[PDB]
Design a protein around this ligand. Sequence first.
Ligand code: ATP
Ligand code: MG
Ligand code: MG
Length: 240
Amino acid sequence: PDGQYLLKPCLSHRERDFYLHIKDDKEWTGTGIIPKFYGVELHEFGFGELEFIRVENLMYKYKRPFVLDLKIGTQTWDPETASSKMKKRLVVDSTSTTTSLGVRFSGMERNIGEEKPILYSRYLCTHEVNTRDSLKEYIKLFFNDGKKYRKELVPYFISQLDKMIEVMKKREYKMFSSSVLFVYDSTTTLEDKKYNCKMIDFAHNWILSEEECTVEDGFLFGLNNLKSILEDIENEFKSL
Ligand SMILES: Nc1ncnc2c1ncn2[C@@H]1O[C@H](COP(=O)(O)OP(=O)(O)OP(=O)(O)O)[C@@H](O)[C@H]1O
Ligand SMILES: [Mg+2]
Ligand SMILES: [Mg+2]
């Protein structure tokens, strides 16, 4: 997981089409809110070729990665979701913070030099991270590198969410089961700039200029609540 690139297969048209749709939009590609997109590529697979997207690896050259995946939206199903998955989708949405906050914990990795990374399962979302207060604490734990709280990194993450909110108010796209990914290298300085905050996983993105999506995603609602939590974390790290 330590190369320049992520070569992600195109298992459906939606992620590929979204990247192609915004590829000349400076609001998407010049703001640093999504991974850098290199293009769609065909690579040999089976009897023919398989379509891939090539994007930057956000953790390139990270020494001790810290990773936090936050799933955004008031629901994680869309009009194309298979019926066999629907009961589980409805339960997890309602018993996590998804329906209430539009954002929920979806996994964490912390490397504190303890000879093995500490993995926090995404299934913690319906039991241990099922409240706003518990979600705030786990994000605080993400900013804990094992020795201190990296309070200086928080303003970057709020700034990233601000740019995300600005583009999503235009409501040109609906996104389901997408995430905002928090990463940083604990060995970094503010000048090394080895930290990042990006939207990812657009496999269920709808292009509203080309198709209808009746249900709402609650994506802007989730982004605002996540920004509010980080602002609370900023105010609470002042006592350090
Ligand atoms: N550009 C990136 N650079 C580095 N890591 C990434 C990047 N995009 C995603 N990741 C990480 O790598 C793994 C990425 O998955 P993706 O977002 O690719 O999942 P999926 O394959 O679409 O599966 P699912 O829908 O079940 O989450 C995730 O766990 C995410 O943390
Ligand atoms: Mg995902
Ligand atoms: Mg996906």
